[PDB]
Design a binder for this molecule. Structure first.
Ligand SMILES: *C(/C=C\C/C=C\C/C=C\CCCC(=O)O)=C\C(=O)CCCCC
Ligand SMILES: *C(/C=C\C/C=C\C/C=C\CCCC(=O)O)=C\C(=O)CCCCC
Lengths: 263, 274
């Protein structure tokens, strides 16, 4: 079956690329410099952001003129809108995972409900380095020091991620690897309220086998990578529950009803 | 078949399984024999209520596991006090165990302490699974058995300390692990590398890297028909962190509701900044 574990890896990879525009391969090229030629607009401070508004014109999120006056908030609000796009990108990838659409409908919903955050932060790592994060289709780059530079909880929000991203990218995984890995996270059998755990585990098991092989063939060198990677799943839960803490803590900062409802 | 390389990992597994038995009086194998009734001499006194509770000291010898205290208006607290001191003991044991882990004492003195600082709880709840079943847990070295229900009816705060534990025991006990698997597993947990403060990480990782190898071989060798038990086992680590944290949160409250309740210094030197 070690040609069945290599077919499923490929399919996932091929789907991973068909559902996600900005890839680890890409994002990584940008960040550094390596043959690209069109540098990103660096948001490093106030005039940077405001100029970034009509440059990368990330006025997809920025509009809804009932803001503009509250930097820290228009930024976090930005992540909101962005994360929502990702979620649709994730759902689509989900349906690519063999067996996923065959499960009970409620379970797919539940699996996705409890997995997006973990999947968002994992990929968010591909788009950041020790000094900053890539924004809007990788057009820009929002420095890291500028994010702490935000007042209330708005400067503790991203910093945790940075610490995670650092440990995560240290694994030096690529898109081939992350595709399968993302699949594993989704097929989590301990999501509360599931209905039929057996099918899901059977799938995650097939995924775990595929992910192990992927790691061996792709990183003969790196020992027990498989293990080190599964362990990071712990860091995601924490990063997440924690992130979801501020979401509450930060309900004390005056912040259309349609839009709220869209989130 | 068996090769040079793999042979090194077998000696390692056997070395640790051997240190583990020598550091823990109540192995899982014994706990199970006690629990699954395969005995007429290993039967524990069951506690599911105050009367049973009262009878308890009147059977399951209690040299005051809940030291210095003829009593205390609350059983819930008297229990808590026992539970506390017991943990104090498990730390001591886990500690004797650690020292025997190849390379562990050869590390920076401070790191050794940070590994233990965080490793203790995670390890304590793993071992605590061994003493449980959906219905309760063993106490006093297997001599007694306190039901899940009793514990769950204790009182406002305290009636919330064990549930999360039973929660994990049921799922974890499902992997069907035995003492020899747990010894290597308990060893991996200690040799993390991402513990808050670890001055020198790398060396800690070369050790773990190896323990994982032992665990991987051990598991396959001991569960041939158990698909990805290795990975399924590693994921359970994420379950442990939550238990731990859920616990700390828990203590904190107690520290205000009951200003008369004391905590072991050692136990506090763990929690302080967790
Ligand atoms: C946003 C905060 C958390 C993560 C939310 C969304 C990230 C979404 C997708 C990751 C990339 C997936 C891919 O490459 O396809 C942090 C920010 O990025 C800052 C938002 C700034 C917007 C103005
Ligand atoms: C402690 C959980 C239960 C303790 C129950 C009753 C305590 C009363 C007497 C104990 C007798 C001594 C003995 O049990 O040997 C849960 C924890 O917080 C972690 C403890 C882990 C135990 C290994």
């Amino acid at each position: 079956e070690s040609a069945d574990l290599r077919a499923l890896a490929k399919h996932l990879y091929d789907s991973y690329i068909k559902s996600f525009p900005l890839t680890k391969a890409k994002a990584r090229a940008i960040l550094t410099g390596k043959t690209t030629d069109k540098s990103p607009f660096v948001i490093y401070d106030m005039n940077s952001l405001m100029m970034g508004e009509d440059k990368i014109k990330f006025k997809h999120i920025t509009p809804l003129q009932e803001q503009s006056k509250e930097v820290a908030i228009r930024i976090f609000q930005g992540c909101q809108f962005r994360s929502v796009e990702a979620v649709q990108e994730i759902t689509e990838y989900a349906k690519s995972i063999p067996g996923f659409v065959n499960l009970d409908l409620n379970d797919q919903v539940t699996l996705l409900k409890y997995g997006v955050h973990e999947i968002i932060y994992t990929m968010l790592a591909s788009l950041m380095n020790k000094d900053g994060v890539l924004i809007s289709e990788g057009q820009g780059f929002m420095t890291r020091e500028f994010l702490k530079s935000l007042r209330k909880p708005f400067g503790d929000f991203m910093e945790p991620k940075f610490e995670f991203a650092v440990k995560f990218n240290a694994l030096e995984l690529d898109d081939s690897d992350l595709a399968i890995f993302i699949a594993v996270i989704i097929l989590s059998g301990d999501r509360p309220g599931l209905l039929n755990v057996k099918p899901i585990e059977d799938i995650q098991d097939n995924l775990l086998q595929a992910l192990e092989l992927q790691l061996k063939l792709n990183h003969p060198e790196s020992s027990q990578l498989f293990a080190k990677l599964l362990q990071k799943m712990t860091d995601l839960r924490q990063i997440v529950t924690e992130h979801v803490q501020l979401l509450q803590v930060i309900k004390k900062t005056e912040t259309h009803p349609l839009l709220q409802e869209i989130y």
